[PDB]
Amino acid sequence: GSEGHRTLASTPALWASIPCPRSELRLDLVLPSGQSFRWREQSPAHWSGVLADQVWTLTQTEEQLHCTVYRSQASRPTPDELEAVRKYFQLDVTLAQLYHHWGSVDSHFQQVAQKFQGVRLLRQDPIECLFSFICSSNNNIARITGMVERLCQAFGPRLIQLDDVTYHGFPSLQALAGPEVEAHLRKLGLGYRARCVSASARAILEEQGGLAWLQQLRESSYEEAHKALCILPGVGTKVADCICLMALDKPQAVPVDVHMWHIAQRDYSWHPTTSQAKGPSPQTNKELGNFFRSLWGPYAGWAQAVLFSADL
DNA sequence: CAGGTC
DNA sequence: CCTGG
Ligand SMILES: *CCOCCOCCS*
Ligand code: NA
């Protein structure tokens, strides 16, 4: 079929393979699990979405990540285009090695990781990540997804249309800093989060030095990146850790939420000892993150993603 | 209220 | 202070 979303069977000549066993990556545990909100399984086991400013469809067999890209002449992805996929999934980070370390120092991980292999962190764009997770407060994956989708339709550049889906790039800072964006985003149902989207776009672009300020947090320390993000409206401790882990190359960031608290007590018998408060608070949440960073090591945020994936 | 942020 | 379950 020359129209529509492709499948491995329908258009074999347009797919290229990255050697990637299923223990290193499971799309079904990584793409709909609340890292990115913009991947869809348009046909069974085939995930479509925007990757490096282009639309891709991904599906995997036992040893191979099959990829196809929609650019005007149809042809399978080139080696350079496939490298964008490897960088997005950070395939040089070997889960077999990470899982071995986490199981070595943690018996509970070793037990529950066996049925949940292939859970890894995407390397997302800071802009998309920052604003997606600004929208994540008081909100669920289903509603976040719709909010992000309508956000991208209204302000993001049109790319291509496959079947009845028009794919849009994520909006620019300039777009999100434009006139009346908050009112517009309110019409799309973002509620109070609409103000924080507009306010954070204007803050970065008009007070912080622009896109280079955000992107160069990738080179700053984790502590520096977290501090800087927390200046932005809508970015609290938890949101900043999400962005640090998922977009700013801080694999030791541990977004502490009540879900992490339940896991900390149930499976690790953890309780706070730097403070005397017994439940969630700034002080105790910080300790909880430090606790998992010394238990799991510099990739604690990835280990958390494995555990989170078990529950869901 | 529980959850996050002001 | 907001908010959705
Ligand atoms: C409970 C949220 O507090 C108000 C700040 O909102 C930040 C996202 S717009
Ligand atoms: Na803030």
Numbering used by the authors: 9 to 79, 83 to 323
Can you list sentences taken from the study reporting this PDB entry?
Most forms of damage to the heterocyclic nucleobases of DNA are repaired by mechanistically related pathways collectively referred to as the base-excision repair (BER) mechanism. Both the recognition of damaged sites and initiation of repair by BER are performed by DNA glycosylases, lesion-specific enzymes that recognize specific nucleobase damages in the genome and catalyze their excision through cleavage of the glycosidic bond. Among them, 8-oxoguanine (oxoG, OG) presents the greatest challenge to the DNA glycosylases responsible for its repair, due to its unique combination of structural innocuousness, extrordinary mutagenicity, and chronic low-level production.
On the basis of this screen, we have selected the Y207C variant, because it crosslinks efficiently but is substantially distant from the active site of the enzyme to participate in the catalysis and does not interact with DNA in native LRC, and crosslinked it through the X8 linker to the minor groove N2-exocyclic amine of 3′ guanine of the target nucleobase. The complex produced a crystal structure at 2.35 Å resolution with an intrahelical target G•C base-pair, hereafter referred to as the interrogation complex (IC). In both structures, the target strand remains in the same position with respect to hOGG1, but the non-target DNA strand of the IC structure has translocated by half a nucleotide step toward the 3′ end of the non-target strand, marked with an arrow. For example, R154 and R204 contact the non-target strand backbone, instead of interacting with the C opposite to oxoG (i.e., the estranged C in LRC). In the presence of oxoG, hOGG1 establishes a stable contact with the target strand, while in the case of G it fluctuates back-and-forth.
